[PDB]
Amino acid sequence: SKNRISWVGDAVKTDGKKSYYKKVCIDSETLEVGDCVSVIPDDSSKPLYLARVTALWEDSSNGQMFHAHWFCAGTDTVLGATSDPLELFLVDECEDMQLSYIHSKVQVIYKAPSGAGSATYFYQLWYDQDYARFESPPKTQPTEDNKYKFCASCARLA
Amino acid sequence: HRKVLRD
Ligand SMILES: [Zn+2]
């Protein structure tokens, strides 16, 4: 939902037919080439389309325009849905489009390959094996007398 | 192929 659109800065290039720009002000926000954008599909029930703004230009025939380089989610691939709803995939699908179709400005980052990391065990909760329930870890404290051999499980069960 | 065909 975008209704008030204004160019930012002088035109970077001119076709004599198109006037390319580097930044746009849409409503409150400022959008520039390279930013990413969300678009509602024709079927509103479908998830948001996401794209990278590769160009911005004013057209004598079409008006205020931009070029959308789409991303895609796992459901759009042979994979099916992915484990993370924030996961996207690059894909070679493009589209010229009106700026008024932009739903919102979104943040898309590239996550570079990473290593295995510190493979150590961890815990977060305490399991009451009698009542089959999880709680925050109990804060049973040792004394200065039995600290050298304190077992928090020995203390509670006593 | 083109995705959005709205008007
Ligand atoms: Zn393209």
Residue numbers in the entry:
A (entry chain A): 724 to 842, 859 to 897
B (entry chain F): 18 to 24
Question: What does the literature reporting this entry say, word for word?
Answer:
In mammals, DNA methylation is stably propagated by DNA methyltransferase 1 (DNMT1) during mitotic division. DNMT1 contains a C-terminal methyltransferase (MTase) domain, preceded by several regulatory domains including a replication-foci-targeting sequence (RFTS), a CXXC zinc finger domain and a pair of bromo-adjacent homology (BAH) domains. Here, we report that DNA methyltransferase 1 (DNMT1) specifically ‘recognizes’ H4K20me3 via its first bromo-adjacent-homology domain (DNMT1BAH1). Here, we show that DNMT1 directly recognizes H4K20me3 through the regulatory domain BAH1, which in turn mediates the chromatin association and enzymatic activation of DNMT1.
To understand the structural basis for the DNMT1BAH1–H4K20me3 interaction, we determined the crystal structure of the BAH1 domain of bovine DNMT1 (bDNMT1BAH1), which shares ~94% sequence identity with hDNMT1BAH1, in complex with the H414–25K20me3 peptide at 2.65 Å resolution. The structure of bDNMT1BAH1 reveals a twisted β-barrel resembling hDNMT1BAH1. The H414–25K20me3 peptide extends along one end of the β-barrel, with the side chain of H4K20me3 inserted into a pocket formed by Y772, W793, D799, and E816 of bDNMT1BAH1 (boxed). Flanking the H414–25K20me3 peptide, the side chains of bDNMT1BAH1 D765 and E818 each form a bidentate hydrogen bond with the backbone amides of H4, and the backbone of bDNMT1BAH1 D765 is further hydrogen bonded to the side chain of H4 R23. Distinct from the typical Kme3 readout that depends on aromatic or other hydrophobic residues only, the BAH1 domain recognizes H4K20me3 via a pocket formed by mixed aromatic and acidic residues. Mutation of hDNMT1BAH1 at or near the corresponding H4K20me3-binding pocket residues (D768A, Y775A, E819A, and E821A) significantly reduced its binding affinity for the H414–25K20me3 or H414–25K20me2 peptide, while introduction of a W796A mutation largely abolishes the hDNMT1BAH1–H414–25K20me3 or hDNMT1BAH1–H414–25K20me2 binding. Strikingly, the H4K20me3 binding by DNMT1BAH1 causes displacement of the autoinhibitory linker, which frees DNMT1 from the linker-mediated autoinhibition and leads to allosteric stimulation of DNMT1, reminiscent of what was previously observed for the DNMT1RFTS–H3K9me3Ub interaction.
